[PDB]
């Protein structure tokens, strides 16, 4: 099955994901190179979803310059009826990768953490708070993690996980701030160190959301060889966002600096 973007032809290999309005295809160009193409059908799209898609493509373009931990955008086509975005194709997404590992190498964990901090730092410096980060938002490319989206448009699905959801996102039911992204990052790092997310054991979604915002529900932090890692996790998972560690503080933390 064939796709045309700005007169260039691509062969579809498989469907990576689907959204409401959109689909993402692993694709083959004329020179036998692999890409990922996102297609957005705008024919049935209110001004809201239209503007979210315009905002996403504008931010994705702007951010090309500012970090290589943001997904590469090679080309795009926008029309009143559709958007195509020709992007790099990753090896595998973080969620699938974590799912198949029994354990994570401390060095690999640290290096992926640095990638995530950098990517999220760079969107924050442009005024974007993702506010729904989770392992599926990161992608492995060249042994390096890249953030693939910004929380701006409706995101890709290959019921929803709420294991990474920040307290103040639950309280919007706007207190969402850059600290919200720190919480979610902490939850990913927590999974990478202890093998479970902090509230994985609580099966019922509503019960879990209550637990996420309840300060009397202690999160467990078993002692581990790496004391700096343990402190990162505790600082990320503070329920008061005022007391929760910031991205610049995480970038100067011993965990990422003392090697
Ligand atoms: O929509 C995306 N980003 C928003 C800013 C516009 C988006 C979605 C998916 C990908 C992307 C690019 N590459 C992948 C990938 N690669 C692994 C594969 C999975 C299935 C076949 S290959 N898995 C999942 C998602 N991938 C990149 C950007
Ligand atoms: Cl191209």
The active-site residue, picked from 132, 149, 223, 228, is: 132
Question: Which method was used?
Answer: X-ray
CATH 3.40.50.1370 fits 92-259, yes or no: no
Resolution in A: 2.3
Spans of all domains in the chain? 3-91, 92-259
d(CA 164, CA 179): 13
**What residue has token string 């045309």?**
4
**Cα of 90 to ligand 1 centre, how many Å?**
6
Topology of the domain covering 3-91: Phosphorylase Kinase; domain 1 (3.30.200)
Residue 246 buriedness (CB in 10 A; 0-12 / 13-18 / 19+) = middle
**What residue has token string 């809201």?**
48
Whose CA is closest to 117, among 38, 188, 221? 188
Residue 36 in contact with residue 25, Cβ under 8 Å?
A: yes
d(CA 12, CA 1): 5
Given the CA of residue 91, which atom of ligand 1 is nearest to it? 17
Q: Interior CA angle at 153 toward 149 and 158, to 5°?
A: 65
Whose CA is closest to 196, among 94, 105, 98? 98
DSSP string covering 15-26: EEEE-SSEEEEE
Do the domains spanning 3-91 and 92-259 agree at the CATH topology level?
Answer: no
Which of 14, 21, 26, 137 to mutate for ligand 1's pocket (most ligand atoms within 8 Å of CB)? 26
Query: Is 231 labeled as catalytic in the residue annotation?
Result: no
Dig out the tokens for 225 from the structure.
């060889």
**Cα of 100 to ligand 1 centre, how many Å?**
18
Whose CA is closest to 177, among 131, 144, 113? 131
């Amino acid at each position: 099955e064939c796709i045309s973007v700005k007169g260039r032809i691509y062969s579809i290999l498989k469907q990576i994901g689907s959204g409401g309005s959109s689909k993402v295809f692993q694709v083959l160009n004329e020179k036998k190179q692999i890409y990922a193409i996102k297609y957005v059908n705008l024919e049935e799209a209110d001004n809201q979803t239209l503007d979210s898609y315009r905002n996403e493509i504008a931010y994705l373009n702007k951010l090309q310059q500012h970090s290589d931990k943001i997904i590469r955008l090679y080309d795009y086509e926008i029309t009143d009826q559709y958007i195509y975005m020709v992007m790099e194709c990753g090896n595998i997404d973080l969620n699938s990768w974590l799912k198949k590992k029994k354990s994570i190498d401390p060095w690999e964990r640290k290096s992926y953490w640095k990638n995530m901090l950098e990517a999220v730092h760079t969107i924050h410096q442009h005024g974007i708070v993702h506010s729904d980060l989770k392992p599926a938002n990161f992608l492995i490319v060249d042994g390096m993690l890249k953030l693939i989206d910004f929380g701006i448009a409706n995101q890709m699905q290959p019921v929803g996980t709420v294991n990474y959801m920040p307290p103040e996102a639950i309280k919007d039911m706007s207190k969402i701030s850059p600290k919200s992204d720190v919480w979610s990052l902490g939850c990913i790092l927590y999974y990478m160190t202890y093998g479970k997310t902090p509230f994985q054991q609580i099966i019922n979604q509503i019960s879990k959301l209550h637990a996420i915002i309840d300060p009397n529900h202690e999160i467990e932090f078993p002692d581990i060889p790496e004391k700096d890692l343990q402190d990162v996790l505790k600082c990320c998972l503070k329920r008061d966002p005022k007391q929760r560690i910031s991205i610049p503080e995480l970038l100067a933390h011993p965990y990422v600096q003392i090697q």
